[PDB]
Amino acid sequence: NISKFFIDRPIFAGVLSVLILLAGLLSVFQLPISEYPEVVPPSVVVRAQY
């Protein structure tokens, strides 16, 4: 049984949870932020004067 392995070794579960928490904390600070996602189609503008 998968749960019986972790029942008798709480430290293994603690280490796994701490690793997951550390990965999340390290990764959260390198993520872009914006109010809304990219929905506006890209466009190109050419300007001339006469």
Partner: protein, 198 residues
């Protein structure tokens, strides 16, 4: 929400130990989600935070189910270790099944075309990652903590238990009596409902 779930767990279960398990399960299952987003090349916005706020309920539900089953097994009359064994003997299968069916519900609706799918994709992916991580965390952390912290029904009360008994001594009994009466009435009602089905 964390304070609310702790309070309701304390009120319904009348044990200060069981409140520990959700408190250490709600944050991790959230934080571990963030990293996976960087694996998929996503960015946080209103939709992702709304998805987190909504999946907090699923995480609480899963933790509540596990803790309640373990506490019922304890109230049956077994020691913590055998109670945990028996409780986890009949929860892993349904846990994997519910995780798989939530994945099957949420994944395809990220494939819509147009603006609607563009708005749907982030929410769906975030909630799917969150529920997968929550199921994984519930499979591992919760039973070990339940077997470690929770104690038997015949153990000598500690100081915190003494304080909680001397502060809330009659509210618990009144709540238990009301809950038992309501449970009996609901059982009678469901028995009556089952008889006629057309």
């Amino acid at each position: 929400a964390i304070a609310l779930v702790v309070v309701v767990v304390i009120l319904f279960l009348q044990t200060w130990r069981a409140s520990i398990i959700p408190l250490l399960a709600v944050p991790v299952s959230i934080i571990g989600t963030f990293a996976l987003m960087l694996a998929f090349g996503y960015s946080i916005n209103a939709l992702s935070l709304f998805g987190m706020v909504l999946a907090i309920g699923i995480v609480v539900d899963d933790a509540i189910v596990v803790v309640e089953n373990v506490e019922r097994n304890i109230e049956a009359g077994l020691n913590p270790r055998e109670a945990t064994y028996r409780a986890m003997r009949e929860v892993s299968g349904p846990i994997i099944a519910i995780a798989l069916t939530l994945v099957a519900v949420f994944v395809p609706l990220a494939f819509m075309t147009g603006l609607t799918g563009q708005f749907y994709k982030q929410f769906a992916m975030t909630i799917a990652i969150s529920t997968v991580i929550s199921a994984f965390n519930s499979l591992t952390l919760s039973p070990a903590l339940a077997a470690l912290l929770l104690k038997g029904h015949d153990a000598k009360p500690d100081a915190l238990t003494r304080i909680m008994n001397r502060v809330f001594g009659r509210f618990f009994a009144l709540f238990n009596r009301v809950f038992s009466r309501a449970s009996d009435r609901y059982s009678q009602g469901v028995s009556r409902v089952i008889s006629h089905k057309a």
